[PDB]
Amino acid sequence: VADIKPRSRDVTDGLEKAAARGMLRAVGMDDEDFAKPQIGVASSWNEITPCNLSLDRLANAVKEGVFSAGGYPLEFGTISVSDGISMGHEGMHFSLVSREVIADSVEVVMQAERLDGSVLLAGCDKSLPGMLMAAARLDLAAVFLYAGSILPGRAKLSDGSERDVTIIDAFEAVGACSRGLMSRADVDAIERAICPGEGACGGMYTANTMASAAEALGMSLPGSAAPPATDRRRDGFARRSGQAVVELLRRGITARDILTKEAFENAIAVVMAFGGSTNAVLHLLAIAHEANVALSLQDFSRIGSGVPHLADVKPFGRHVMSDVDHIGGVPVVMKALLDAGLLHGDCLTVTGHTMAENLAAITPPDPDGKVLRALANPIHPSGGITILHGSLAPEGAVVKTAGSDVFEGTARVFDGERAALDALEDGTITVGDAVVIRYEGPKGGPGMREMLAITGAIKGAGLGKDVLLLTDGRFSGGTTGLCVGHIAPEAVDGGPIALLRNGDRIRLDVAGRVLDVLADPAEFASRQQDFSPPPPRYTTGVLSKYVKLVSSAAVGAVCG
Amino acid sequence: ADIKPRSRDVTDGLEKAAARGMLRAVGMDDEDFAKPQIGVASSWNEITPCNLSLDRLANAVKEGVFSAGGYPLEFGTISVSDGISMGHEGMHFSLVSREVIADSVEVVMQAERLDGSVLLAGCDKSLPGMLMAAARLDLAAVFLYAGSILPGRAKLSDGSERDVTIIDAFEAVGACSRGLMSRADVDAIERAICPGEGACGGMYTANTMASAAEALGMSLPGSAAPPATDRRRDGFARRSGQAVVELLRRGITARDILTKEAFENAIAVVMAFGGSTNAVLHLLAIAHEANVALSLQDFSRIGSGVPHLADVKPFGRHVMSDVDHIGGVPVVMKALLDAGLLHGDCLTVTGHTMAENLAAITPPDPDGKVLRALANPIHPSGGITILHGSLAPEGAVVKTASDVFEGTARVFDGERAALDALEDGTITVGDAVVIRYEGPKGGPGMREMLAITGAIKGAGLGKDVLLLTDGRFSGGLCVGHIAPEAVDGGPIALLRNGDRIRLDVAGRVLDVLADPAEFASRQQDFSPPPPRYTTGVLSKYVKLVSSAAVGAVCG
Amino acid sequence: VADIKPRSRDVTDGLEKAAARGMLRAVGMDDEDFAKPQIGVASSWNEITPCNLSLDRLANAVKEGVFSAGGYPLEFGTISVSDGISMGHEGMHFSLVSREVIADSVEVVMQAERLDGSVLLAGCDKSLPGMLMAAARLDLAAVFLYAGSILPGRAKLSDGSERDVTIIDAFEAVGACSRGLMSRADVDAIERAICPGEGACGGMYTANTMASAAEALGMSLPGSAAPPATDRRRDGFARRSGQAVVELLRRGITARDILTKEAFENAIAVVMAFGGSTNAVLHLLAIAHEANVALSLQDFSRIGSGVPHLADVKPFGRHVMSDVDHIGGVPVVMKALLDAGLLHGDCLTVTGHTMAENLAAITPPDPDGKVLRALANPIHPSGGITILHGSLAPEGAVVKTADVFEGTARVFDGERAALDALEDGTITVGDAVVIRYEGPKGGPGMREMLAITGAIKGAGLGKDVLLLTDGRFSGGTTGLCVGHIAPEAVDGGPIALLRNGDRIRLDVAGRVLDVLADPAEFASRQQDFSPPPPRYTTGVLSKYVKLVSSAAVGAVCG
């Protein structure tokens, strides 16, 4: 039978623990509490971004649930950054490393205090995988709860027209204004509308994709991802999350009993079915690594080839998470995939029951057909994300799936985004070019920046469907099937992307899953002698440490 | 000066429409884009009493920043309990918390383009973690302490009444296991040691570093001493938010304040307070983060000229609330300055110098009981002694509560083997007890070991044996920080059972008295154990951490 | 120059104030804060209703504003009830009395602590006029800030239809279900959608009406009413409210400098233009009484005559307050009224500037034409509200209008007797149904009855019967529902002398409500009138009944 106190007997039990008991009294524990499991309630609450604002009330509601189930909760805090506020300046270099700092933050507190289990609360992009990575690493009972999505805003423009707007509409408005196609007054109108109050980005970006993936991994209560941050149903999910973690301790269940290979395959299938963020490839690889579970880029290909793209969601589709909530949330996609034999029903979850048993209990409706397509009428018969291999990316790369044709182009090679933006401004990027931005990898950037300026400018210059964008970094906001990221090995590791020179020919076959450089292997291989990595830009502090310890993007840019 | 050295990246120009749009959703309006943005970094949590006051104090810092025309944005970071972590595997995760906290503040401040910070900490390692981030960022930064816990009084079965704390609970446990105290009396002490919010009241790491923060000029003068439960801390909080905005108006940043001279002020004040040996490790690391040259020999030099004045636990009688009653940290600082043992011209977070601050607040002279006048010291020199010599070529640290101490080496790989030996009677009077592989890499995490110090004292061998480690000690002669550590093939790794060790306090020497040639002939036989932690924060820490001799810095 | 501490030198200055200073240190004041004005921040925050949830964060942002302007804020709390959750049970008798308890609560703290000025924060119906009454009564610098409106919720029905719903839709769902016209599943779908999270009722009920009235009185910052509770623009209005109260102290401005006759006329005009709640009549009469300003039911008639219904907003219209916010909020209505000469521009406000000066500074757009109509194309030519007098209501009555009814009286002592007669089939087409002993004293608490209006409406009798009370009515019948009949039955008004068979006439155009029995015989019955004994002989309602005035003067307690 499970010990409901697998760690906290180190601080509560026996003559020798008098000093620890004396300190725990001073945070409120009394005689009756020392026999209870201790639950760490880790919140990335802050006011530096709206994404995290709901986590204060939700952590409180988690503590109420832990108490309701006979546990003792202890709240603590960790950082997040704003993936939105950090865009367009030096802060973009500090987004992905925040993931590592959050996972380490949770590990250190849980290990130091000998807590038995956790509930982990996150809002903004990198804090979700940061928490899930800590949960995997610790292999204690753990429940993940999301902040919830922001509500959509509506801009009134100068011509009397109106549009629903989000972050991307603010960046695009700036671009329209710079090309003389939009007034500064109309950029102002969009700015005032995009973010009304608390909640993470409403589109299918990293936060909503990973909140959906956490339901799919069985690490969040089914139905918990979709209700908006402002919606008090989140409070109920919070109290039930605190109750659930105490029951996992009673069962002797830990995070690695839930994070099995099959649970990761269920996350891949759900992310493929939502046309989730390509960032979910990086994060799910990293979470598998932290859970000591074998997972490769090819597992993404294999599962993704069998799962249709169903969700018509921003940024590439029409709808936002509040619309997915309205038609029944993530359980609708999970039930559709289970009924089609595309989900492992027998995966244990944080309910203490299997994915199939959870879905039987809540009986989601069928896909509505607009927000989530019917399985027989999908956006694409296979996954919303495509994994590539070939001579340019022998350790793999990722691209959002298109309808389209094969692309061949003459390589145009840049060390960093700034160089490519300059070349675009000077007219040296034209139809048929393959634009290659290298030294943007985990080590090269450093931090593997999500670049939005080059995709924005290519679209603005009308070159959206005529140019191929390729990077060892990441892209946001480009044309489906024409922005390739995560090219491994990255330039700093002397991968083929580092050997490229202006004029080399590149071929991308998305349907055939191939990204090749057309140069004679022998001739191409011997330029290897000339490769030299630029010296690290950041020689002190968190980014200097990151560059020393970080792995390839091909295995999730893990540091441990 | 430009009052927005950073935040123009998120508030200014056409291109910042998206960042402005998100900043409106945390409550900023049109008039707030022109204001400096202050990160208010709280290590608040409920896992230890040390951090409980930080929630209301963060709120008061925000009120201060608003009152001075800034815009504060609160965020959280971790802290661990140095007390609750004692006696189990959690002790391996105490020191590394310092590095995670420093990184966490750097990440938020760099990602969000904030102009300055107010940094709030309670428990041992969170104070140096915040100070290291401030030094590393080189923006306007003010540090504010959670404040001390109130002392609790235990009534014992024998009608006795004593003020008790963590060490009193650990000692009670030892007394009870040796049949010299009832379980009833152990329970009475348990119930009294921590009544509620505030850090340890003795001159442990937290109070030492809070005092050192005033001495660095990084905290408002007088701010360290008021207890966590006292509402004067709220006024210091509001004045801390006001102060950071004024630093922006004057274009002052942390490295303007953290000069070599400020570090020598901090060492002076720590020596005078009988401060924790942990302050050696933390000030070396904070200087490294400020790009300021600071070495163990700097500690020895300042320490030679600065007497121990504070009669404070654990060595003395009083706690920080007693220090508060008689005028707090500025009383020690004025006494040192008057004697020419403090640099008066050091710029501080007030925008004025240490001398100008002390002139403004006119602290009283030492009271004679809680703080001694200079002519009347507890010891004529600093409590913290720096050693070198053939066993510690890169340095070691000992609290000298000044003769030659010796022993035949009894050598253990980790604390457990030393305790097993004490239990088997194989440790006797005159032994030099060496616990190696407890360094930053070896432990890993350079534990502050309490089990062996407690067990030796409990066995009556306290004054009869020498204690030596490449890790750290709490309670109890106890030599720590021995460098290079065992994992790096330092002399401590070559020691064998029987080697003669000599500690010479006067000469500042810790020697192995082996023939140098015979001793060096042992190097070929050394091989380090493989890392115990192969995943997570401790596998990373072992890969990056420096020698304790330069502060166990990671980057 | 005005003393910026008109009250707080009683607790900070002089030898005798040593104790008071020592206590203020313990809430955080240091030596420098004793020279600052002290601002009471009064929050009706609670969790008993969603209406109040935003007030915790907004009270915090008020404090930031006070600190930003050199004041020292001290937060304290008062009650509020839920006008929604109180509906349908004995709790309804405790709604209006909460207004008086809230007013007394703020008076007590402000007078005890010698605070210089206040920011008052309210969300649910009765708490807004409670706070405004306290502000008028104290005559210190005061700024009012609303919680903000709830967001609209979307129900998907078994039908496959989708509706935006709120409380009335939940109560009508229940009526439709018990008459076999809606499934239980669809009632549950509506229940789940009506209230997503924090905020007050989104329609033009008492809260939104009084929040709009507060902007029109000059007691709230212009544009502050309309932004939803969940919208962080409310935080900016909170910080500016804290800044505003300190600047009122610097200028020596107090609440009665702002609450002039002209400002109440502004409030009446804005309430009429919004098709606002008839409860606004009761509360604006009470606020004017507390402010020592002459205001009568006749003023509502005079101003109401000249102001058209502009806002196409629930419950009458289609839209909710978030829609009004989208098109530029209450300032759009106030500028429209100012330009048409239907607003007094020279009224001093909590900005320290005039109503005209404020609207010039923020330049609201013109009415959009859908949510807010231009005056050229109003919904109704005159105000939604009609004031009546006559032999049945000598001290007046109030009816929501949109023509001449004559009927035989069917008389009930209390709503329950009327509901029983409807189920019995005793209430029929042509009846003038009289529910008496529901006034301030009679009820007690002048309940807003929804059960009889819903049951009559459900029974298809809406257009066929006249509903009359000395209480209040909530919801329409799609017919005529006359409230506030004064004097009330307890005070031996005509309503108490009525008997089964008397005839009654209601002439909306004539502003008349008459009992058509012969004067001489009707008077003859006064000798045998005996009021029932108070049901509540203990506690707050026993004290309320002893002190409350006529609804004709706002049901004030003195």
Ligand code: FES
């Ligand atoms: S920026 Fe935080 S979730 Fe998008």
Ligand code: FES
């Ligand atoms: S345990 Fe936290 S300061 Fe002592």
Ligand code: FES
């Ligand atoms: S019930 Fe509170 S505003 Fe309607």
Ligand SMILES: [Mg+2]
């Ligand atoms: Mg909280």
Ligand SMILES: [Mg+2]
């Ligand atoms: Mg992102």
Ligand SMILES: [Mg+2]
């Ligand atoms: Mg197991």
Ligand SMILES: [Mg+2]
């Ligand atoms: Mg707080």
Ligand SMILES: [Mg+2]
């Ligand atoms: Mg310590």
Ligand SMILES: [Mg+2]
């Ligand atoms: Mg400088």
Ligand SMILES: [Mg+2]
């Ligand atoms: Mg509050």
Ligand SMILES: [Mg+2]
């Ligand atoms: Mg009401």
Ligand SMILES: [Mg+2]
């Ligand atoms: Mg006056």
Ligand code: NA
């Ligand atoms: Na570049």
